């Protein structure tokens, strides 16, 4: 119900309120509602057909609201999660909820890393250093999948008798994506 959140003296629109905004398909299950300290509201939406937990709202030690923001479509099928932390403080009746800022960019980066990068989470690159990628063999079927994904029905990419299959220049992005995207990650390039 509190319309606004706090971020370092600045007032943002309330993110919780935002994420729970109604819409066909979403389902909220409040458990243990009557006792404050143990309550756990849980949002479950249709993800790739079947229903699944997307958001998890509860308290933590020392008055810290936590909004577990969950992404179900991952690299290994094992759901990843972004821990959003908010200081609840009943002494400021007007803006009780403020966001824990220390390290907010880092948490968001860590979750993106697990989704993009098949490597260990190390944000200690020199932005000026060359980033080596990985070797990459172009399978006949990775091409079928890509062409059909973007809708490119060029015969140069379709397996025909007595012709080697060609890959779309577009496919370059599939190969370099991990080497390139890594470049916006270092700590010296702190971004949200």
């Amino acid at each position: 119900l509190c319309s606004f959140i706090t971020q370092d003296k600045m007032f943002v629109s309330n993110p919780i309120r935002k994420v729970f905004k109604p819409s066909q398909g979403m389902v909220v299950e409040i458990s243990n509602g009557n006792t404050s300290s143990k309550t756990v509201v849980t949002l479950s939406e249709p993800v790739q057909g079947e229903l699944k937990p997307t958001v998890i709202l509860k308290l933590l030690k020392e008055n810290i609201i936590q909004m577990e923001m969950i992404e179900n479509r991952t690299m290994d099928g094992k759901p990843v999660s972004l821990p959003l932390l908010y200081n609840f403080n009943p002494d400021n009746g007007f803006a009780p909820i403020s966001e824990v800022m220390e390290d907010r960019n880092q948490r968001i980066k860590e979750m993106y890393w697990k989704l993009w990068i098949d490597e260990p989470f190390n944000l200690d690159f020199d932005p000026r250093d060359v980033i080596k990628g990985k070797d990459f063999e172009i399978t006949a079927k990775e091409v079928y999948d890509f062409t059909h994904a973007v809708g490119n029905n060029c015969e140069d990419f379709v397996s025909r008798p007595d012709r080697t299959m060609l890959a779309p220049m577009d496919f370059a992005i599939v190969v370099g994506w991990r080497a390139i995207i890594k470049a916006i990650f270092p700590n010296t390039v702190d971004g949200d």
Partner: protein
């Protein structure tokens, strides 16, 4: 030429081939948290989708 194009029904298909599992494009609650109009189509899709048009009509479908 002036051609008619269309963005996909869902974004999962492009995300799978490309390796862009960015939730912004696939999960409504992330899209909504970032304050986007919805689950934005992959800008990369439009890149390859439009390119295909140029490839077809401008290069006479000679990939080369």
């Amino acid at each position: 030429a002036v051609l008619d194009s269309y963005t996909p029904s869902t974004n999962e298909p492009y995300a799978r081939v490309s390796g862009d599992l960015n939730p912004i494009h696939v999960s409504r609650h992330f899209a909504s948290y970032a304050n986007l109009p919805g689950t934005i189509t992959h800008g990369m899709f439009s890149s390859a989708s439009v390119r295909a048009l140029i490839e077809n009509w401008a290069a006479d479908s000679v990939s080369s």
